[PDB]
Amino acid sequence: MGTKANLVTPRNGEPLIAAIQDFLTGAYLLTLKDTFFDRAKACQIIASILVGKDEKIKVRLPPPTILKPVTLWTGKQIFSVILRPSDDNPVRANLRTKGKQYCGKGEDLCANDSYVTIQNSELMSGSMDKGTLGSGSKNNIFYILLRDWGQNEAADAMSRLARLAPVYLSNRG
């Protein structure tokens, strides 16, 4: 009866334990295409995820996606730190799906940007809707982290987002 065992309801197979309310609207506003963090805010949002079984990892900030005119990270690159904070973490999550307000035409290249593509636990395109993080969808990441990589990595990546996404949202307002 542990929560790490019953992440999944026995009617459908859907996950019931997943983000609710603010965490979803936190991580959507963070993985939205427009956000850009400098190494000021980037190491501040990331270092929120270092308490309570997580304080003993060499947290690897990914290299930034703009270099020359100003160097700054993007929002989705910091959401990848949720799925794989350390260097020696064995999680490689993979997911490709539609989203809400889907563009209809175009696979992943249209400007509406509602098409998630995660390769090796690095969010490559798209923004995290409810349908890619919440409860009820069989293609959110916490369901994908459950089936492919055990249930400890799904509960850790869900308890990482609950610590990370309010720390962004309370400073974004």
Using the rule CB under 8 A, is 166 a contact of other proteins? no
Among 36, 89, 148, 159, binds other proteins (CB under 8 A): 36
Residue closer to other proteins by CB (options 162, 167) is 167
Using the rule CB under 8 A, is 104 a contact of other proteins? no
Using the rule CB under 8 A, is 87 a contact of other proteins? no
Among 73, 142, 143, 149, binds other proteins (CB under 8 A): 73
Using the rule CB under 8 A, is 101 a contact of other proteins? no
Q: In terms of DSSP H, where are the helices of the chain?
A: 22-30, 39-46, 75-83, 141-149, 152-172
Q: In Å, how far are 83, 102, 116, 126, 133 from 95, measured between CA atoms?
A: 12, 16, 7, 11, 12
Q: Which residues have a Cβ under 8 Å from the Cβ of 63 and sit 6 or more positions away?
A: none
**What strands, in cross-sheet order, belong to the sheet with 123-125?**
95-98, 115-118, 123-125
First to last CA, the chain: 37
User: Position 97: which residue type?
Assistant: T
Tokens 């290249």 belong to residue: 109
Using the rule CB under 8 A, is 50 a contact of other proteins? yes
Using the rule CB under 8 A, is 140 a contact of other proteins? no
Give the Cα separation of 58 and 167 in Å (integer).
20
Helix (H, G, I), strand (E, B) or coil at 123: strand
CB of 119 to other proteins, least distance (A): 5
Among 89, 124, 159, 162, binds other proteins (CB under 8 A): 124
Using the rule CB under 8 A, is 34 a contact of other proteins? yes
Q: Which residues bind other proteins (CB under 8 A)?
A: 21-22, 25, 31, 33-34, 36-41, 43-44, 46-52, 55-59, 61, 63-77, 108-113, 117, 119-120, 122-125, 167, 170-173
